Amino acid sequence: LRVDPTNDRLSALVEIYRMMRPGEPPTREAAESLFENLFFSEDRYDLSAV
Amino acid sequence: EIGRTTDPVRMYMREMGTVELLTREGEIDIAKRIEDGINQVQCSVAEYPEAITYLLEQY
Amino acid sequence: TEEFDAIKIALASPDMIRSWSFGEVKKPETINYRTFKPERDGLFCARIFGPVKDYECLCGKYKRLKHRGVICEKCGVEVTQTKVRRERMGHIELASPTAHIWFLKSLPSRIGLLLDMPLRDIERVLYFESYVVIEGGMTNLERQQILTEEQYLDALEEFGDEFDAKMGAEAIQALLKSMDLEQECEQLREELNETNSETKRKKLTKRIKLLEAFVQSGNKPEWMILTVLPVLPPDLRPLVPLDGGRFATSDLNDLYRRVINRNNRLKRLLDLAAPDIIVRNEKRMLQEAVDALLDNGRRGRAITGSNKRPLKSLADMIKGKQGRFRQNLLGKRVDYSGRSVITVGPYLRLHQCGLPKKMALELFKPFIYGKLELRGLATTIKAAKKMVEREEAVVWDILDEVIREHPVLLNRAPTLHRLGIQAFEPVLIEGKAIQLHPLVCAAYNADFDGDQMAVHVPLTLEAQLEARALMMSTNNILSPANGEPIIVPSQDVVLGLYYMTRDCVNAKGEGMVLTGPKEAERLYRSGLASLHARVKVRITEYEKDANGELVAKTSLKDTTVGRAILWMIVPKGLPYSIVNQALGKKAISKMLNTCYRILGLKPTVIFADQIMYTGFAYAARSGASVGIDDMVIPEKKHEIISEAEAEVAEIQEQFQSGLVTAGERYNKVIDIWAAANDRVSKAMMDNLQTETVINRDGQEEKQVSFNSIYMMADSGARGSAAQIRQLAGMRGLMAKPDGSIIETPITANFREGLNVLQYFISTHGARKGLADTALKTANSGYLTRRLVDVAQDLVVTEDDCGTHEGIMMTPVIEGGDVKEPLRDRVLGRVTAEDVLKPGTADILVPRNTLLHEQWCDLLEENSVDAVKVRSVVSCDTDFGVCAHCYGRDLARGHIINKGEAIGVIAAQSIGEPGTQLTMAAAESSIQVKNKGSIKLSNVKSVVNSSGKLVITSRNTELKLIDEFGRTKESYKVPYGAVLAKGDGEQVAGGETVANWDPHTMPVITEVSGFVRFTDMIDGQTITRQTDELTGLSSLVVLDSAERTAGGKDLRPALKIVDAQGNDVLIPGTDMPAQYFLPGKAIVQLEDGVQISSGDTLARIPQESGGTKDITGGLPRVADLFEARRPKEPAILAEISGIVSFGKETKGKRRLVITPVDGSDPYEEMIPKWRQLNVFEGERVERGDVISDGPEAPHDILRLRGVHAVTRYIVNEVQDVYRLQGVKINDKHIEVIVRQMLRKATIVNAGSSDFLEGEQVEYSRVKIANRELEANGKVGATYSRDLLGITKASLATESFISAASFQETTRVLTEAAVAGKRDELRGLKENVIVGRLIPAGTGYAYHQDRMRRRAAG
Amino acid sequence: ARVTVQDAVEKIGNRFDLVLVAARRARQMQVGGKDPLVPEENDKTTVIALREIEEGLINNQILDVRERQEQQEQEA
RNA sequence: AGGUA
């Protein structure tokens, strides 16, 4: 947490969006969509029964 | 942006992101100023006789 | 037909690029799809690159050979030969200048360093991330600085029509235009004479060297930015029709199509005055496309449609592995060659091999045609072709004729050493497999289990002769890595010989008296006697004596019938004692070696063939078979297994009691099982060895068993004692994953079938072995490639140079005993000094001369401890080595012939055994195993009141002088020890001559008085653990890895002063009286204690070893040849004189050596984690260690000298090799070393830059020139530098060799920017060029060319 | 058939220019113009050159002097 | 791709 430069969801989304795609000005909606589709999209992320 | 990038796609998106989208009447206003410019150049050609002589030759 | 002495590489100019081009490629069009005629003017174009089909315009206008000197002017297409399409280059006129990727993303960026501008800045400018000022004006803006969008806009608004700044490759090219080289060179030259600041002078020197090099290259920096892009001839990027919708197209074709598309789009956009964003985007397109074309892979890959794969680029086609593809590998395919499976050739003579009739016919078709037309059986080549395809009996006699004298080369699929290719006389055989001589398969490392060998036909008469003289098997009876023969009887023939010579205790026909071995053969073949039986036979042995004359001595020998039968085979001139013995592999190899040394070549070859035939015949007559009963289980196997189970059960029970620790319990169990395994193996070997108990005449006797498996074990045919141990005994301990030895071993063998679980256990060992073999094979291949690279250009160019330098040569003793004697290491070497006898001062070895067996025997008789030997490293020859300094070894006992390539043979010799490399009473008390004179070397010891010969420092050795001059046992005495023996006292064998605690090194005082604590704070340097019983303490001097905040400002020491307080110095020792305590020196004696000479002062704790710290095998050998650091370099005393400590702990503690005379100040760094063995105020000498641990080759060469580093490398590598039983003549490692140090660093120049890494040969010829001349400029002084084999091969004089087998792109870029001009005179350079190599047969040719060059 | 070239190496100690001189001799043997000096067993030029060098008839010096004398009768 | 040394 000390190392963390962010303190809110929006800046975390910005950092995630910039690390996943270099540059790429962090549009808030784009960052939210990227984060949701990375791990919470059934058509983009799945673990299956196993 | 300056993000140790080497992809022209990325900074092309950067370039296109600077300009904001237009509306329906915005296109009409820009085309209106275009029409004003082309009318100005048409008047400039109008004050020139020789181009008009050439046009009449083709007519 | 083409003559050229050298190849120049340089920067291509746009003008000369247009000069190469025959037309401008303006369209990305390729062909007309349905009509495959190339378009105009596309990537494929007859108007540009020439016509497609032979000598006809591609318009249907001219179709004849007449129209060839005139091109078709009735249309664009020209008419020439079609091969012209393979050579004509084109050019593309780029609308915007484009940067070259090679000059950009190489680790040294030539664009970056020429502009002295960091890489990120070039990347951002070129890729249009930021602007850069291409010269300013009267602004506050520098001549060169990057500006962002808003910064550039602000500068433009603030500064009007004075501001010249662009963006991208155009800006870079403008910058290169604005930069002038010669003027800056003049400015730097002026400034250097005026400037005195160190950093300023260094900057000026670096820049002036760079600019002067660029000017000497004759290149203009603007050429780094490509304005016109050359395009490769279409034939080298072929487009060939294929069936269906698929057609073979070059990735180069698609890349050039993309480049042309983007260039044309840029041209159109510029013509349309497109917005700045779009034109910048299209320039980005062009830059990316050009970068991918030149080298796709450093820009985030480029893929094409309908195919997901990185596109091939020009760099990717050049850069290859291993080495350049088309030139050497992969793979330089060859004609007139065949391939087939090999079988045994047990009837063949050594100089011949079986070649199947069909392969012989197909291989020699031109020869068959020639001879058929010669005798006139066919009137044309076509008729001869019909005759040979009909395979009539007529052509077969022609085939026999052409084969009779023609030799053919046989080649193994992997080639590890020069014996992998050998000539043989082909013998026609019906069948389909190549029959190979059984003796030769050992050299090929080929076992007949489906191995395939290739056959090559040396066509020209010179090549036929060359194969017969050099390639021939009979000419290569000796390994190039060692004088002992390589064609040695191996397994079946060895078994037959052993059975024929091994004697029984009772058999038919014992006690008979025979004359000649002929009666022995008659008795054996008639069944009137047995093959082996003690018999007196009268035999005439011939002895080479007097001057080389045979001495016939006829007398009676007590031998066996089989031995006499063998002696029949043995050629005249050998002693009978050689065969009157049981013959294993070693015995037969030694016998062949003696036969070759005594008789010569032809008797050796004939004798080898005859012994092969005899061994095979008598092995077949032996009927040696392995049954199920010939693995007799020892009777004590169950008893030993049950016992060991009992002790391990007891140990496990005691472990549960907590009496023994888990580690100690594990070690005890492992030791118990190891003892059980040894007992079982010994019982098995006792059972099998003397299994025969049959009576000689009625009295039973124990003698060597007739058991077959014991015959193959003892004769060394196949299977050692360890091998038979897994069969008849028990296979014992193995390891599990993580490489730990399993607690419970395998108690079963292969005669008592392993159960499921034990087999599953053994599977891990099997998998590990197989994976190890694969990885070690790959690593050995890479290693031998690097050795060939570094040793490529070395060749014997002079018969003699003249030099008394060399290496001090001694039998090597590591540990406590000698494992490699003087004779073997000196055999075949040349003397460098006329060494006297160990007694009288008599010269028994004349001036520098080759040492053959007779001289080695003379040296053994008068045992001299050391011999100076001319090594290749000390040879004064340049551009090669003199014949003497190398030696004799090849395939002959004579001196090396001038022109022989020793580098390649040495590289192969060191590389080939790489597949064979898969890798108390010590330090407590020295026990001399034999009785000899005791001698101390570099000893610092004085006898004290207790008679203790306490040795100080860890640089003292204890040798063992034998009866004449030879050391036979050597040991290392650590810092602090007790010795009851003197410097001349005789010591019995196995007697403890020295002793010290295995728990700690004791510091035994050699003086008396009170102990004074110098540089002490009780709590910073030492800690209080006072346990006073008689005045003692457990004060701990903190270890020399970390200390306290006040323990890092002082060096804790114990001064010895008398009652008066005056210093009492230790006599006869460099050590001062103030013991500088190193890390963990526990101060037992407190301040104010009278110390006696013979009392411990401070103990240094240890562990009596018990931990492995030695590695070997391929990684060790590679690290030795790469001159890698050992992760803890043992720093040496780098100058003689008195030593002293400096200021303590600025992070790293400083040590100042000031010589007693001369330049005093030699302060240096020492890291605080090291364990110092240096004591301030002692007289050290250059070479003495300063800290413990392993050494690195660099400082060894730098300080102790070239000879010392050569000795170190040779000894270390030979230690790895002798560990596996492989013997290599040290001259190979010597020449490899000589190639490693071919670069030196200039201190004082003659025409150099005082720091220039320069080839030593040029430095040596320059210093010779200045010394012979009256001009002693400057100068000039040099220091030899050591580089790893990869680095040495990488920094050669010829860029072709470096670019071939190493980083091709970077080497080519460096050569181009430097404008290098390699002048050949190197094996691989001439190989790439395609002319005779300057080695061996070709050396005569090149030497002729040398005479034709530089002179009429 | 010539099993060994050691005897030839004895006459010409370099063992490399031995190849050059015997190749020159064998090429003059195969290419028309020169006639043999040692009996053959239906053998090609190579073992002929080896035998000629082995008996000392041909080395570098003899080949060179012979090419002179032949040059002088052809120039006449 | 699999297999051979």
From Swiss-Prot, chain A:
Biotech / industrial applications:
Co-administration of salinamide and rifampicin or salinamide and myxopyronin suppresses the emergence of resistance to both antibiotics.
What kind of modification does the protein receive after translation? Answer: Acetylated on several lysine residues in the presence of glucose.
Query: Where would one find the signal peptide in this protein?
Result: none
**What is the stated purpose of this protein?**
DNA-dependent RNA polymerase (RNAP) catalyzes the transcription of DNA into RNA using the four ribonucleoside triphosphates as substrates.
Q: How does it assemble?
A: The RNAP catalytic core consists of 2 alpha, 1 beta, 1 beta' and 1 omega subunit. When a sigma factor is associated with the core the holoenzyme is formed, which can initiate transcription. The rRNA transcription and antitermination complex (rrnTAC) consists of RNAP, NusA, NusB, NusE (rpsJ), NusG, SubB, ribosomal protein S4, DNA and precursor rRNA; S4 is more flexible than other subunits. In pull-down experiments interacts with CedA. (Microbial infection) Interacts (via flap domain) with Escherichia phage lambda antitermination protein Q; this interaction renders bacterial RNAP resistant to transcription pausing and allows it to read through termination signals.
**Family under the similarity heading:** Belongs to the RNA polymerase beta chain family.
Q: What is this protein called?
A: DNA-directed RNA polymerase subunit beta
Curated annotation (Swiss-Prot), chain B:
Where is the protein situated, by its record's location annotation? Cytoplasm
Domain of life according to the entry:
Bacteria
Say which family it is in.
Belongs to the sigma-70 factor family. RpoD/SigA subfamily.
Domain comment?
Answer: Contains 4 domains, connected by flexible linkers. In the active conformation, the domains are in an extended conformation, each making extensive interactions with the RNA polymerase catalytic core. In the autoinhibited state, sigma-70 factor domain-1 packs closely together with sigma-70 factor domains-2 and -4, contrary to the extended conformation that is seen when the protein is part of the RNA polymerase holoenzyme.
- Summary of the function given for this chain in its UniProt record: Sigma factors are initiation factors that promote the attachment of RNA polymerase to specific initiation sites and are then released. This sigma factor is the primary sigma factor during exponential growth. Preferentially transcribes genes associated with fast growth, such as ribosomal operons, other protein-synthesis related genes, rRNA- and tRNA-encoding genes and prfB.
Q: What is this protein called?
A: RNA polymerase sigma factor RpoD
State the species of origin. Answer: Escherichia coli (strain K12)
Q: Which residues of the full protein are shown?
A: 90 to 148 of 613
From Swiss-Prot, chain C:
Note on cofactor: Binds 1 Mg(2+) ion per subunit. Binds 2 Zn(2+) ions per subunit.
Pfam families in UniProt: RNA_pol_Rpb1_1 (PF04997), RNA_pol_Rpb1_2 (PF00623), RNA_pol_Rpb1_3 (PF04983), RNA_pol_Rpb1_4 (PF05000), RNA_pol_Rpb1_5 (PF04998)
In Swiss-Prot or TrEMBL terms, this protein is called DNA-directed RNA polymerase subunit beta'
The reported effect of residue 750 to C is: Resistant to antibiotics salinamide A and B
Reaction(s) catalysed by this chain's protein: RNA(n) + a ribonucleoside 5'-triphosphate = RNA(n+1) + diphosphate
Coiled-coil annotated residue ranges, if any: none
Record's family?
Answer: Belongs to the RNA polymerase beta' chain family.
Output the PTM entry: Acetylated on several lysine residues in the presence of glucose.
Q: Which residues carry this modification: N6-acetyllysine?
A: 959
Q: Which cysteines are joined by disulfide bonds?
A: none
Organism's domain of life? Bacteria
**What is the species listed in this Swiss-Prot or TrEMBL entry?**
Escherichia coli (strain K12)
Q: Report the SUPFAM superfamilies cross-referenced here.
A: beta and beta-prime subunits of DNA dependent RNA-polymerase
List the HAMAP family. Answer: RNApol_bact_RpoC (MF_01322)
Q: What does this protein do?
A: DNA-dependent RNA polymerase (RNAP) catalyzes the transcription of DNA into RNA using the four ribonucleoside triphosphates as substrates. Resistance to the antibiotics salinamide A, salinamide B, rifampicin, streptolydigin, CBR703, myxopyronin, and lipiarmycin can result from mutations in this protein.
From Swiss-Prot, chain D:
One example GO MF annotation? DNA binding
Q: Name one GO cellular component term.
A: cytosolic DNA-directed RNA polymerase complex
Transferase among the record's keywords? yes
What biological-process terms (Gene Ontology) are attached? Answer: bacterial-type flagellum assembly; bacterial-type flagellum-dependent cell motility; cell motility; cellular response to cell envelope stress; DNA-templated transcription initiation; intracellular iron ion homeostasis; nitrate assimilation; protein-containing complex assembly
The UniProt keywords, alphabetically, are:
DNA-directed RNA polymerase, Nucleotidyltransferase, Transcription, Transferase
Enzyme Commission number, as recorded: 2.7.7.6
Q: Which reaction does it catalyse?
A: RNA(n) + a ribonucleoside 5'-triphosphate = RNA(n+1) + diphosphate
What's the top EC group for this one?
transferase
Residues in coiled coil: none
Q: Could you tell me what this protein does?
A: Promotes RNA polymerase (RNAP) assembly. Latches the N- and C-terminal regions of the beta' subunit thereby facilitating its interaction with the beta and alpha subunits. Part of the processive rRNA transcription and antitermination complex (rrnTAC). The complex forms an RNA-chaperone ring around the RNA exit tunnel of RNAP. It supports rapid transcription and antitermination of rRNA operons, cotranscriptional rRNA folding, and annealing of distal rRNA regions to allow correct ribosome biogenesis.
Its family?
Belongs to the RNA polymerase subunit omega family.
- Name of the protein in its database record: DNA-directed RNA polymerase subunit omega
Q: Whose protein is this, by species? A: Escherichia coli (strain K12)
Full protein stretch here: 2 to 77 of 91
